[PDB]
Design a protein around this ligand. Structure first.
Ligand SMILES: NC(=O)c1ccc[n+]([C@@H]2O[C@H](COP(=O)([O-])OP(=O)(O)OC[C@H]3O[C@@H](n4cnc5c(N)ncnc54)[C@H](O)[C@@H]3O)[C@@H](O)[C@H]2O)c1
Ligand SMILES: NC(=O)c1ccc[n+]([C@@H]2O[C@H](COP(=O)([O-])OP(=O)(O)OC[C@H]3O[C@@H](n4cnc5c(N)ncnc54)[C@H](O)[C@@H]3O)[C@@H](O)[C@H]2O)c1
Ligand SMILES: NC(=O)c1ccc[n+]([C@@H]2O[C@H](COP(=O)([O-])OP(=O)(O)OC[C@H]3O[C@@H](n4cnc5c(N)ncnc54)[C@H](O)[C@@H]3O)[C@@H](O)[C@H]2O)c1
Ligand SMILES: NC(=O)c1ccc[n+]([C@@H]2O[C@H](COP(=O)([O-])OP(=O)(O)OC[C@H]3O[C@@H](n4cnc5c(N)ncnc54)[C@H](O)[C@@H]3O)[C@@H](O)[C@H]2O)c1
Lengths: 233, 236, 236, 233
């Protein structure tokens, strides 16, 4: 409907957390537009993992730094990196070990992946897309580590945008709203969302396809809200 | 070479400030993608005005409220409104009458256009795109009215996003960085370039491509948003 | 019981919208701390107007530009300007004339007052304090002109902070949350309270204490800033 | 000049990174207004450490979680916690171990300190003050971990503001500009600062004394810029 069929033909994309939810939809969207895609994640062949002849599914815990490095070293080419893998442990995040676990996946692994991707992305130029959150803006009483990590990922986006510009690598983020991947909480969220519905994973994916392509040639360091207006209400 | 050719086939777009610069490029981008476009502005047939068989060029000062209303009433259909018209009078903006002139075009005319567009946009749903500025974020000593007006246009974007959502009218903004629209100030260029990670001027079609995305079906869950198209300027 | 009694002894403060609510509390707070204060507003001697021997109450519609200028010209001295006057007409703000009325008071009058104050504030340095809003951040479907005006006042704050810094005039804003100024809407109260971490209305003197800090020598490196005094509302 | 002499009389304050720079000035400011203060940091008796009869100087690496916990357990009372300790390793932050070191001190230790302080602060109510940065807003090519950590600390501030409100604990941050604690870089910074000078440590301290006191009773989740206008230019 929106993009020309082969706009990423001949390109290589790697999506962390590609094995379900938003990552799976992003992987599918790039594959559908001609890219070869590596969908990295846990339970890489599970029910929610994306099936497509141009998507290779790979089981990998990206906090395993050495294993991640080997994977990147084996890649002959990379045009786009999507740092999508993210977790929350809700109120268990008040436990320090758990807080640190959440940061390590949500932030530190994204930093490492970006640095491992960097020499490949510099070959022809390319892009990085990080996934932020409403909690990059609002605080969360129930998930302090998640909120902290998402504030961090926005500043990492802006910092790597500055650093990688000279290598023609653009670095952006999407801040999704409540994406369908407690009656009272649902009602609260829906009342505060102008569009009054859940966001859908493919809607984040369509934004990803735009931000990582040549129509966004002057876009770097940006955070695009894909949230049905939630931030505004 | 990003979008399918007919995304906007059968649709009607109206771009204020369509007679030069960013507005002209936005008008051309929508026309390219199949839309009929009305390009409203001053000097509507000037050298910088967009030429295309699907672009109607119309001379209209949009601060003329009655004339603007008549134009909108004559439209049988409208799918997208782009509130792009904007001016600055630099340090003359310290004069109150001039300050108010800048606000009247940059903000009040955008409010009026949005309200005149609303019943048409509500028919099938549609979108509004406002043009913000780096000065929606940073202050400007040399153009206080411009900066004020662009902070206003961002809150207007968010407010109308809330109001118009129930009519399926999405309302977003682009905050362009420094776009080469007809710079001779060597020192200013150097200052801007030092603060722009991509180290160049933006081009009007680069703003236009973002407009084509935000106003289309790939942005169905995007409303109230401000997208920076600025080469990283906000980050440095 | 926070500030020393004479921090503003020998100084002159002018508060627009000083005749009720937040403005009245700000005027009282500066008067408490030794300042002579002019409280400008409508119904200047009404029930909500601040009574104090160091507060002169003056009836003045600040959209009357010539009258405002005469008042400022009569002042022998000015150290602090508080642009607090603000109005909303809720959904009547969809009417353009009303939209412009709200902008004219909330933004343009603040610009004029700032410029009239400027030569006096430049004598020894001094400060300007603007009053923003939660709707400088969030949009408001029910008051688009109010929200637009408050986004504008934040960018005006930042712009004049840049412009006036070389004259040692600091320019800041407070963004108050929901302040109990004379609520009967049970549903609205419940919505606001659910989103306020401190789970209560703010009180006018609580905004006033922040004003006393921002405009004083403990805030010597604070300019262009917006301080939220909102019980956490922006965070929830 | 600004505050009444005994406004924090009888109260207990703990400042992390209290042994130099901004932390030292904050410690002095609270002590001068009547508080008993623990100034925790490295080189706790060094030249820059604050000397005052109401300031106890304590040598403690706050990444030593067990030692920090013991210190908090020994406190009979706490009214204000200032999470001021912060580091940067500049471009060495591109090394993952170093990136993680910076996060661990700048963010995780602040989370732990806040949680250890929480039961004491809940006794009578009280406040937490975190120290943010210009790089909570702007990215930094030369210090990505620092910028990430400071984006994180702003979201942690907002998250703990939401969580701790019911216990009458207010949680705020100051975003200092360039504080005097490369000719070309100096010139750039000074040209972009409207007040055209360095900020001074006591100027951050005066803001701290306001935010943690009863004149800021309705202020929580706030970030106050103390930056000479830098953010605006
Ligand atoms: N769902 C929402 O409403 C929402 C809102 C805002 C932001 N986000 C962000 O979107 C991203 C994806 O979330 P989702 O909603 O699709 O969740 P999800 O749980 O459906 O998917 C998470 C993905 O991350 C992967 N993952 C987790 N730990 C991993 C590890 N150690 N190594 C490798 N992969 C790992 C999972 O295997 C999975 O593929 C996250 O960063 C999340 O914070 C989601
Ligand atoms: N050029 C930049 O770098 C830049 C950066 C950020 C934002 N912007 C914004 O982009 C928008 C377009 O600016 P541009 O750079 O293309 O400038 P431009 O001067 O080339 O375009 C101005 C357009 O607005 C029209 N206009 C002016 N007054 C009008 C009136 N009274 N009635 C109707 N139309 C009127 C003009 O005729 C013209 O078509 C403005 O809103 C501007 O603030 C521009
Ligand atoms: N009440 C809140 O919860 C709240 C929240 C955020 C911001 N604010 C802002 O605080 C400020 C004060 O509002 P308030 O709640 O105290 O309201 P209020 O209605 O009690 O005060 C309005 C004041 O402005 C004056 N005013 C109105 N029109 C004027 C004119 N033409 N000329 C001169 N003075 C005029 C009034 O006479 C009065 O003194 C406003 O800027 C408002 O937007 C209020
Ligand atoms: N100086 C500036 O311009 C500036 C600007 C913005 C933010 N900040 C922030 O202000 C805070 C203080 O910085 P400063 O400029 O005073 O720096 P500084 O180096 O003078 O002081 C840092 C303090 O943190 C302590 N510290 C470091 N590692 C520690 C550990 N493991 N355990 C305990 N204490 C430790 C040090 O011993 C010292 O007391 C930091 O959070 C910094 O990011 C400073």
């Amino acid at each position: 409907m929106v993009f020309q069929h082969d706009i990423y033909a001949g390109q290589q994309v790697l999506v962390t957390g590609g094995s379900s939810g938003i990552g799976a939809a992003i992987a599918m969207q790039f594959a559908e537009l001609g890219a070869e895609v590596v969908a990295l994640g846990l339970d890489a062949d599970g029910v929610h993992a994306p099936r497509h002849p141009r998507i290779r599914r790979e089981e990998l815990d990206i906090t395993d730094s050495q294993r991640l490095q080997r994977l990147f070293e084996a890649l002959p080419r990379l045009d786009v990196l999507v740092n999508n893998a993210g977790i929350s442990r809700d109120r268990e995040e008040y436990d320090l070990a758990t807080f640190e676990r959440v940061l390590r996946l949500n932030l530190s692994a994204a930093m490492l992946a970006s640095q491992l991707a960097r020499p490949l992305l510099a070959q022809r130029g390319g892009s990085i897309l990080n996934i932020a959150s409403m909690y990059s803006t609002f605080g969360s009483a129930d998930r302090p580590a998640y909120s902290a990590s998402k504030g961090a990922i926005v500043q990492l986006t802006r910092s790597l945008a500055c650093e990688y510009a000279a290598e023609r690598i653009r670095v952006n983020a999407i801040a999704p709203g409540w994406i369908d991947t407690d009656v009272e909480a649902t009602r609260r969220i829906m009342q505060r969302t102008p569009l009054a519905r859940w966001g859908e994973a493919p809607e984040v994916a369509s934004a990803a396809a735009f931000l990582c392509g040549p129509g966004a040639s002057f876009v770097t360091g940006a955070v695009l809200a894909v949230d049905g207006g939630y931030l505004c209400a």
